[PDB]
Design a binder for this molecule. Sequence first.
Ligand code: NAI
Ligand code: NAI
Ligand code: NAI
Ligand code: NAI
Ligand code: 36V
Ligand code: 36V
Ligand code: 36V
Lengths: 331, 331, 331, 331
Amino acid sequence: ATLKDQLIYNLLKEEQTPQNKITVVGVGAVGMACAISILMKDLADELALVDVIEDKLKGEMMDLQHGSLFLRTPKIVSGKDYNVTANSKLVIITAGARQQEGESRLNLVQRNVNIFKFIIPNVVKYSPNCKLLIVSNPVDILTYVAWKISGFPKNRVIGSGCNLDSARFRYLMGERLGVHPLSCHGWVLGEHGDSSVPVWSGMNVAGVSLKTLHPDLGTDKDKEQWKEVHKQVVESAYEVIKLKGYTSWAIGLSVADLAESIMKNLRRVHPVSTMIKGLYGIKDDVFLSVPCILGQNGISDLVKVTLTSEEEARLKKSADTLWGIQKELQF
Amino acid sequence: ATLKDQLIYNLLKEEQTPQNKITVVGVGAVGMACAISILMKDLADELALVDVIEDKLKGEMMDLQHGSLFLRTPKIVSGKDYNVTANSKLVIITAGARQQEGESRLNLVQRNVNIFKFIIPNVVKYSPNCKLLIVSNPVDILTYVAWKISGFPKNRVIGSGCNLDSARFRYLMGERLGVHPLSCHGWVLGEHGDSSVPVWSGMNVAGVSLKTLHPDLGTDKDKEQWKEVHKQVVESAYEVIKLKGYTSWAIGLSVADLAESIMKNLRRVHPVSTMIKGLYGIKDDVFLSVPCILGQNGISDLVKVTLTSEEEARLKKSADTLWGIQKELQF
Amino acid sequence: ATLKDQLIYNLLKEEQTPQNKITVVGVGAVGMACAISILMKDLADELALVDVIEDKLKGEMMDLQHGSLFLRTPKIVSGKDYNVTANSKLVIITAGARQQEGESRLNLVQRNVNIFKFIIPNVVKYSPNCKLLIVSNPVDILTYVAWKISGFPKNRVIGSGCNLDSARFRYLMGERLGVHPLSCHGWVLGEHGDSSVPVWSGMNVAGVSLKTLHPDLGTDKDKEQWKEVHKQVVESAYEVIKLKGYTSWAIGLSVADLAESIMKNLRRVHPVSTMIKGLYGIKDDVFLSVPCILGQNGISDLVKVTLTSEEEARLKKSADTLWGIQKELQF
Amino acid sequence: ATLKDQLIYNLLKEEQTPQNKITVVGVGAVGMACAISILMKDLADELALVDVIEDKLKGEMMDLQHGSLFLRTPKIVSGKDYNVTANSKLVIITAGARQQEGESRLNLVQRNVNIFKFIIPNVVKYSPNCKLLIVSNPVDILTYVAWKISGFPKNRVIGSGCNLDSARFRYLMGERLGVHPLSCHGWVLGEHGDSSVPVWSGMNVAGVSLKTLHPDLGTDKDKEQWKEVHKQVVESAYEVIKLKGYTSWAIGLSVADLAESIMKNLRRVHPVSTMIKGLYGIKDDVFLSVPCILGQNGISDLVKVTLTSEEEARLKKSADTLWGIQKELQF
Ligand SMILES: NC(=O)C1=CN([C@@H]2O[C@H](COP(=O)(O)OP(=O)(O)OC[C@H]3O[C@@H](n4cnc5c(N)ncnc54)[C@H](O)[C@@H]3O)[C@@H](O)[C@H]2O)C=CC1
Ligand SMILES: NC(=O)C1=CN([C@@H]2O[C@H](COP(=O)(O)OP(=O)(O)OC[C@H]3O[C@@H](n4cnc5c(N)ncnc54)[C@H](O)[C@@H]3O)[C@@H](O)[C@H]2O)C=CC1
Ligand SMILES: NC(=O)C1=CN([C@@H]2O[C@H](COP(=O)(O)OP(=O)(O)OC[C@H]3O[C@@H](n4cnc5c(N)ncnc54)[C@H](O)[C@@H]3O)[C@@H](O)[C@H]2O)C=CC1
Ligand SMILES: NC(=O)C1=CN([C@@H]2O[C@H](COP(=O)(O)OP(=O)(O)OC[C@H]3O[C@@H](n4cnc5c(N)ncnc54)[C@H](O)[C@@H]3O)[C@@H](O)[C@H]2O)C=CC1
Ligand SMILES: O=C1C[C@H](c2ccccc2)CC(=O)[C@@H]1Sc1ccccc1[N+](=O)[O-]
Ligand SMILES: O=C1C[C@H](c2ccccc2)CC(=O)[C@@H]1Sc1ccccc1[N+](=O)[O-]
Ligand SMILES: O=C1C[C@H](c2ccccc2)CC(=O)[C@H]1Sc1ccccc1[N+](=O)[O-]
């Protein structure tokens, strides 16, 4: 007798299990930039949002839902409880705590571990077979933490790692050459952020190695100072923090790009953080960025990049420092 | 020579104008949501941002730029100076002061009018032939204002109006019926916000009028209280503001939708605010939302919705109220 | 070591059951138009092609594969053997002969029924839980045939039906009003092709019913002869056959649109052909087009369009003719 | 007052010109593949079709028009007369004779040059400012011809060239390495034909040079015979032609990729047919493919690829062969 029943005849009310569901944990600026970019790329048939701040969480959910007319993602849900995350193919973690003035790395990392001790087991409960994509900083250590806590095989725990660093690098490279960043190739690997390593040998347009054309490239004897492109990648990040307080759009776009490869099983190669034990003479359980093949199983393969001695030593130093912190952590 | 000259043999120097340039004025949450949505829909070959807060502006510009690898908009610029906006096809105004503790509505309006007194002349100067899309509140008044100051013909001055209202209506309608909002048709017209008017006669799925099936629809005696759907539209806005402090994603997406029709000359029909003088017995210079055809020269046509007497009287009261404020405004 | 093994370290080998797979059966002009449209809308992670002409099938597969760089569908396969179709979510049948000179109605149908007796079991064997979307003509009858042979519930057997008829109608309607077809709403229902029914009561822009503004809409004495729009839909089809020999692009696009709603569980409403027994005084097992909600489980719901006496009689007359052929078929 | 006048109020008439008009000359298999690819990528606000066969032309136009509901290109036009092509930003030429099974593209010169003597002046007459994108075979030679006839500066005369050959190369390379072609980098330059040159020295994944890992790469001594990958690229057209009579989908996608860079001023790098005078000691006005930066002024820059001695010798052989043909041509 109702209006819905006058208007619509139902053939059946079966099942309803999402096929391409994504969860974002943490609805700060980063989380929401991930959400919007993922929504506008039509990657998911369901999106779930989780946070501990319940008002903010509900408000962000509602705001996205109100744009449903202009999207092709028919179900957006949110909640403090992880039942809303059930059956996710991909779970993206941006949650964590902010470092404070004077706080040690060890103490900041330990705080995030304690946070992950609540997040990860509940993610796993409701999506045992998902891929985990860790964005929270320090991303290389927290990828390790998520791997450790989740018990997932290595291929399904991915750190955003040097994906943002490389995108920034390619942007700057584009600007200098007057070429779209898509056609400017170059890889920043190792530890995300301050200690990242630009691999000068790979820097190229149309297969033409910039290093080969200009052997001083990357060295201090370069009159054109191409090393500065990498230094401006790092300066860029501090500047964006200083100017707007946080970074959101670029990270969100980059994470959506990782999600596309994973959700559509593309097997594209991205610079992301993976268990690096057994490479570059690293013998500890540490995660660092190398180019990885990303698809439906997460990281199925990785590329073995030939590094100069200086590049190797820089990754190996990063690995030593990360393990130094990691081995003092309490799970 | 330089590495660049070793790599690249140039045929042509003399650069052209961007051909599909958009400017967003005001990089608050609304402006930046508009921006990301426009970038991800590939509507512009250049995007300009303007604000008066210089640090924020630069920071937002850089953050977007850093995502360039994942976009197809080759030039993103910003500045306080409107020379960065030159030759825009479309300028979206989201700049606004927010109402302060104890401030009256009239005084709030007047402060936004003062902001437009500076913005509009600057926009006109550098893009004399653009379309103006006004989002800033109160949107119906501020669209009138923008029209009056710019001296543009009414086809090139468009207020976001009831676009968001209608999008929200259709999301709720879709949730009630279990149908994607794209296939749920309903129009909210008139004054944006609290005083907006749901046109129950046009509410339909698949051309099957809900009012024809359920004559009580939209009345107090409606046994199923479908009038609450519009109540919830208005409640939603207050709740989102209560929960997260502002709205961004939905308005950003709805503005990109308008921008698409305009930039791609689609001639789709949208509920936006336009000069209504001479319709529904309204005789004052006021802007209210009706379904308009949007394209290359802005609003080329409007659809003449058959309204009930009650419906007309509601638009007329909105018009009287808006005109009443407008004649006390200092230009 | 192979170059591959020197370049790439493998973490695990594969290989998940297909997750978002579509099959197209019949790689003639319609089949291949569907394929390219599906490929360009990023709806599948694997596309399989089947035909009985083996070289042609291989050539079409390779031509698509050669475009792989510009696509986001990582696996394209084909073969005469239906093992290439395993674990498809959606199987689109565009296989068949065409209406011959001299040959009646019942004989052409029977030649396609014979084709279907081989195709359908093979499809069902390798994708027992797929949705079937039938395009082959006469489409309403062959959808029935697919349903009977497959043994699938009715929600999982969909005929393209009046999806194309309705697109053409809205294209013509938009040409008349100077408005994009997306904003020009109108439903062509019933039997696909010559005997389809334009539902004048639903024809509207922005929920303004044209029948209400112009009560002569669709009648003989209409001074503007709007019945010609529908007559032109039918004439258009005959004209394209006369001019070009076949139709491909419009049907290709229409099908991709249906696939989009199904693959993404959108629950949009489309005019497609479904088992209509129990409606409009119809008491035989026939498929006719009504507006259906399309999603991951095919047709979950249909909209109950109010039809005038004449409209209703035209549907019943189609149903009789359709059943009169169907009772005579040999399975 | 007609129904239209009752429904729609006009603010202003006067027709505007399109902003992003594209023309396709020849509505054969290639032309129409180009069309559908361009339409589905939203590159144009007007598409114009031209051919000498008037019935096929109109039929193909109509078929495209009938899919308008599913597109975002509001106007599609066709005609024998080049007045339909006026104001084109980009004009794509796909008209003329194609290869029979086993036939060389170089056997098409007399036929297709004589066709170009009528087509090109007509195109230039109505769109004197357009970019020309030549697809008709033999493409490198006809790009030279189009340049000589048109009197355009060479930046605005672009041959589709080896974009497709490189796309096929990267697909094949992708299959061998288990990586998406987008992440497999490798260039095939020179003639779009038998004399094309694979640039082994530039092939890489994630900037890791395959030649450094595998010094015999591409040589006769190669144990994995990677030269066979190039051989397959050379033979591709013949193989597909033998199987399905012609090739269409891959070139359609290739052409749309090129059109995107041009129309959206991306400045991406693509191997396209252009004048290579001044590189590798070539003095002749020969057109063949090298990587070019493509944008709104067409080819703005050439990338100077560093070729090995053997690579460069092969490219010069290609240039000699093509120039022997080009230089005998009479205008
Ligand atoms: N990998 C990379 O390249 C980049 C990483 N980041 C990192 O991303 C993280 C997030 O960035 P922002 O959004 O700007 O910080 P934020 O502090 O604004 O957002 C964090 C959110 O996580 C939530 N949260 C905290 N504990 C939670 C819990 N136990 N369960 C669920 N949610 C919880 C907070 O309530 C908050 O909403 C930071 O760690 C940041 O450093 C940022 C940029 C780039
Ligand atoms: N039409 C609609 O449906 C909706 C309209 N709105 C309106 O959008 C406007 C903006 O929203 P928010 O981003 O949340 O406000 P906001 O206060 O966070 O941001 C406004 C920005 O405008 C800038 N601005 C102020 N004066 C300026 C000037 N003279 N030149 C350039 N920039 C200037 C501010 O500096 C600030 O960055 C408000 O008026 C709001 O009411 C919001 C939601 C929906
Ligand atoms: N529902 C609609 O609105 C429309 C339906 N159609 C129909 O689509 C069908 C096909 O159209 P065209 O591509 O133009 O026909 P076509 O004759 O060019 O191609 C048909 C293909 O089916 C193949 N085929 C035949 N037997 C087969 C089998 N046992 N297994 C697999 N494949 C087999 C043929 O080899 C051929 O490649 C026709 O029935 C046509 O009437 C066409 C336009 C619109
Ligand atoms: N550059 C590349 O990678 C590729 C180039 N091709 C070439 O594309 C060309 C066309 O191939 P198809 O479309 O398969 O051939 P098609 O035979 O299917 O169609 C060619 C069209 O050209 C038209 N035409 C002939 N003379 C004309 C004139 N004077 N003005 C306007 N139109 C005219 C014909 O009427 C016909 O419709 C051939 O030269 C072919 O070799 C084909 C594949 C790839
Ligand atoms: O932008 C960011 C904001 C924030 C930050 C931390 C430390 C210093 C500065 C900024 C968190 C991040 O990890 C990035 S990303 C980053 C951070 C430092 C250096 C380089 C990068 N990067 O991605 O290129
Ligand atoms: O959501 C909004 C945030 C903000 C607001 C103002 C007043 C009250 C509540 C909220 C500004 C706006 O104009 C909208 S949009 C809006 C606002 C009020 C009522 C209805 C709508 N709407 O679009 O449906
Ligand atoms: O375009 C078509 C080509 C072909 C055809 C059959 C019968 C007569 C004419 C043409 C097959 C089809 O099913 C249509 S679709 C069609 C066919 C006839 C009338 C109306 C339509 N239609 O979809 O609007």
